[PDB]
Structures are given as structure tokens and as C-alpha cells.
Amino acid sequence: LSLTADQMVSALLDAEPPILYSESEASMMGLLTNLADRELVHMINWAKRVPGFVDLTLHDQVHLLESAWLEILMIGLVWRSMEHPGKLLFAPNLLLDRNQGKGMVEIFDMLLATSSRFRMMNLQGEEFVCLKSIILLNSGVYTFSLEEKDHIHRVLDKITDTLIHLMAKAGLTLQQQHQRLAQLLLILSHIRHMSNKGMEHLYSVVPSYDLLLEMLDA
Amino acid sequence: LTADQMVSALLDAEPPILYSEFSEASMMGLLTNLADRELVHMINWAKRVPGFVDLTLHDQVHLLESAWLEILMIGLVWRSMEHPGKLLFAPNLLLDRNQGKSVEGMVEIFDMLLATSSRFRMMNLQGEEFVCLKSIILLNSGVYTFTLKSLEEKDHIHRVLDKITDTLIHLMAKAGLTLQQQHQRLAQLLLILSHIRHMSNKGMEHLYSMKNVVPSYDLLLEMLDAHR
Ligand SMILES: CCN1CC[C@H](Oc2ccc([C@@H]3c4ccc(O)cc4CC4(CC4)N3C(=O)c3ccccc3)cc2)C1
Ligand SMILES: CCN1CC[C@H](Oc2ccc([C@@H]3c4ccc(O)cc4CC4(CC4)N3C(=O)c3ccccc3)cc2)C1
């Protein structure tokens, strides 16, 4: 909460998790499930390095991860796929196009369109890691103590300050800084929608509290 | 449009507060009837949101198909803002969460609505901010799920969303917030739109679990597609 915007960016950039590799349709879904399961462990490690996260109770950290993990998996997929129009880069050895998706193809198309939007806004890495932290802190805050929510709101305020700082350094006018901040946060409501539809697809499943708690390694 | 002209147009577009036409058995019937009547006024409101009628009728329908439940829910939260623990579906239909326990799955959504109302209250959300947020929902909700014409439409929607951002900022500056406070408040408002998107998805699931579940394409087209 005392970190400068430069130090917040550096912390987030240093916390970035690694890109993992993948290990017919049936084998395709098994591969994707296994990849997501391995990514989750790295996601927990990443979350523990987001400044402010571990000041929350363990119970609240678990709730935030429960609400956010699918959104975080999807935004990372969208980021990896930016430079690959029309395809989704699940892993460096697992690049799929829309035809391989043929309720899969509707979510596949939403993800491709998000990656398209990122590509047209020329989303930067520094902006991406702030967006990912906002998903972690924002997604479960409405659905939980009041001190905990205050702390989460103070951290979100710091990430907003950091996003604005990055845009100012890139030379954006104040008007362009506000407009870009808004454009980026409006994409998060589309990522929320995808995660909701993504969950509906998966149930047609979630990591348990105990599993998340164990990976947090109190 | 200037920011002040944008606010004025949105305030003048605001639909009226409707009334319900009581027992737990009749509750879903009253709510359905109320929402059906609200949808008609929502259509008239959307046509008055600057830039909306520049779109094709097809795209207008698609935005309303994406956004209509979010828009009903945000109005409900706004009407309930000053009534802690209650949802003011209508001035004569004010429910608490024990009344939501009647239908399976209802209390979960009721609690999400109550938490949003509580958040609006904690932020002291102003009416001018509210109408901006509702217009953002209409323009943003269906834009990621829409070809030369499509590119032109998306560019136009993003330009109108940028104008509403400038309007939100102007409202906060004219009220004397600092630049830091302006950016922080803008972010806090827009992040609430993710929760509203979440509530609308859970709500749609709830509506299908009961099962005329949504306004059809042609119904929306019919109401949007007016003659002269
Ligand atoms: C941790 C929870 N359990 C373990 C995993 C199970 O959930 C899963 C979670 C994620 C996926 C993949 C996956 C993998 C890696 C990634 O980076 C991202 C994704 C994205 C994603 C979610 C949309 N997905 C799909 O397949 C998909 C993509 C396009 C259209 C339709 C579907 C599979 C299963 C339960
Ligand atoms: C236009 C479509 N038809 C309309 C009827 C069908 O959709 C409907 C749309 C809305 C509702 C109400 C309703 C009414 C007015 C309002 O301002 C807001 C709402 C909100 C709401 C949606 C969550 N709701 C519920 O009951 C509810 C409230 C609390 C918890 C769980 C459920 C009923 C039915 C198809």
C-alpha cells in the first residue's frame, strides 16, 4: 500500500507465472483440463505475489481465488493468443483454431474476439498484469470483513493509479488516459461473462476450498 | 454533444417508475408482469441514448438482447439504494430476502442485488452517474459478440462509450474531486459493471430454471422497428 506505481508494476511483472506446455476431440478436452489444472498451482503462487493479497485472511484469499481463477485462466489465454489471429494459443504446442472447437465454439469465438480487441488496443504487458490483478481482487469482493473489503478497495485504487501512471508515461493526454482506462475495465465485464458461460459449458469442475487452501500453503 | 448535453439527454430519457398491478404464490406473476411493462419503456429509453439509433436495427436488437436483464437489475438496485436490506421492485412491491426464500435459487440473486445496492450506497452514487452507467451497459454488453458494416458499427459504439467516459469524468471534476479521485471513482464504477454482468448471467440461469423466458428477437425488433 506504500509502493510507488513503478514498484507496483515491477512486483507484478516479476510475479508473472510461466507458460506451461500441453502433456481427436476426447483427447483434446483431456489435454485442456490437465493444462488448466497445472496452471492453477502457478496461479496461486502468482496471487501470493500481488501486493496486498496476503494481507487478507486465508479464508478471504481462498474466496477470491474461487471467484477469479477461471477469468484469470482466460485472460492469460487471450494474452498469449494476441499475436495469433483466429487461433487460441492454449500452450506453445497446442494452438487451436475455431474449426477444432466445432457449446465450445461460442466461447471459442468470444475468446478470439477478446484477443482481437487486445490486439487493436495494442495492450502492453504492464497493462495486462495490472488487469489480471484487478480480476483477482475485484471478482469475489461483492460476494463475501468490512475491514477486508476496505483493504481490497485500497489495493484496487493503487492498481488504478498504476494503470494511469503507465498511460501517462506512454505520452497519453489526460483525456486519452481516462478513455483507455475505461476501455480496459469494460473488457473485464466481457471476461466475467465468458467465465460465466465457460462455467456453464464445463458443468454441461471447480477446485475445492480445501485444495485452494492447501496450495496457498499456510 | 458536450458532456453537459450528454447528461441532459440521458436524464430526459429516463423511464418512469412503474407500479405492480399479494402472497408468495402470486409473486413471480407480479414480477414478470412488471418486467414486461418495463421492457416497453426500456426500448423507448434506448432509442433516446445518443448514438444508439445510428446503429442498424439488427445491431440495436442484438445490444438489447444482451443488455435487457442487466438494465432491469441496475434500475432495481438504483430504486432500492435508499432502502437497506430491501429490493424496491415497485413503490408498492418492496421485498426483503426472506420473501425471496420462496423460490429455489432466488435468495442467491436477491443477496447479490442487495450487495450492489449497498455498494451504490457506500459510494453515494449520484443520479447523473447512474444514467451514464446504464447507457454504458446498453452499448458495451453485446459489442464483443457481434462485416465492413460491423467494423463501422463497433467503431461508432466505442466512440460513444468514449464520450460517456468523458461525461463521467466531467461530472466528477465539476463536483471537485481531484484527478486521482476522478480516475479512482471511474474505475470503481466500471468494476461494478462486471458484478452486474455476473448477476445477469445467474439471473438468466434462474429464469430458465423456471421456464417466453426472454424477449424474442422478433419481439424486440417489432418494438424497436417502428413505423412513422
Ligand atoms: C481447475 C478446474 N478444473 C480443472 C480444469 C477444469 O476446468 C477447465 C478450465 C479451462 C479449460 C480450458 C483452458 C485451459 C487452459 C487455459 O489457459 C485456458 C483455458 C480456457 C478454457 C476455459 C475456457 N478452456 C477450454 O477448454 C475451452 C476453450 C475455449 C472454448 C471452450 C472451452 C478446461 C477445463 C476443472
Ligand atoms: C421481459 C421478459 N420477460 C419478463 C419476465 C421474464 O423476465 C423477468 C425479468 C425480471 C424479473 C424480476 C425483475 C422484475 C422487474 C425489475 O425491475 C427487476 C427484476 C429483477 C429480477 C430479474 C432478477 N426479477 C426476479 O424476479 C428475481 C429478483 C430477485 C431474485 C431473483 C429473481 C422476472 C422475470 C421475461
Numbering used by the authors:
A (entry chain B): 308 to 330, 338 to 416, 420 to 461, 468 to 527, 533 to 546
B (entry chain A): 310 to 330, 337 to 461, 465 to 529, 532 to 548
Publication passage describing the model:
We solved x-ray co-crystal structures to reveal how the T6Is bound in the ERα hormone binding pocket and to understand the structural basis of differential efficacy. In these structures, the T6Is are well ordered in the ligand binding pocket and form canonical ERα LBD antagonist conformations with H12 packed in the AF-2 cleft. Hydrogen bonds are formed between the T6I core, E353, R394, and a water molecule while the side arm forms a hydrogen bond with D351 to favor an antagonistic H12 conformation that is docked into the AF2-cleft. The T6I core is superimposable between the 10 structures but the side arms adopt divergent vectors near H12 that correlate with ligand-specific antagonistic differences. Interestingly, the F425 in H8 is rotated away from the ligand pocket in the T6I structures compared to laso and RAD1901.
